[PDB]
Ligand binder design. Structure first.
Ligand SMILES: [Ag+]
Ligand SMILES: [Ag+]
Ligand SMILES: [Ag+]
Length: 137
């Protein structure tokens, strides 16, 4: 059961992990589709980290207090395959957390953010699943 506070505390580094992996994709991705996805992840999730940080300090009067395998990704023969393998369940975790917080929060800021996370990351999961089939199925 997430609260606004615990959600931000956990979703911030969770998002940062996705961003870090997407950054690696800018260099190492094989398919242009994956590079485009990576750019979207960086743009959307950096923005959301910024919003969460701003709100956290407003609401709690203090800054946000400080799981994926980048090593495995960097050495994979197929970067895109390993990226998808890790990013799908990572995204699924975000969707799960967001869906729960949506039922717990009273804040319009969080309600809208949850909708964005659920919509965008669900769509990206669908894309990645199809690409995986096309490329490796
Ligand atoms: Ag996240
Ligand atoms: Ag993710
Ligand atoms: Ag979690």
């Amino acid at each position: 059961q997430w609260t606004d506070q615990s959600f931000i505390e956990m979703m911030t580094p969770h998002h940062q992990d996705a961003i870090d992996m997407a950054e690696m994709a800018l260099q190492k991705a094989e398919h242009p589709e994956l590079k485009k996805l990576a750019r979207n992840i960086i743009r959307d999730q950096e923005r959301e980290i910024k919003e969460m940080k701003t709100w956290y300090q407003q609401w709690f009067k203090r800054p946000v207090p400080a799981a994926m395998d980048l090593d495995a990704l960097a050495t994979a023969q197929n970067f895109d395959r390993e990226f998808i393998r890790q990013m799908i369940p990572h995204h699924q975790m975000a969707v799960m957390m967001a869906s729960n917080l949506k039922t717990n929060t009273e804040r319009p800021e969080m309600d809208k953010l949850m909708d964005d996370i659920i919509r965008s990351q669900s769509a990206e999961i669908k894309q990645m699943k199809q690409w995986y089939q096309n490329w490796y199925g």
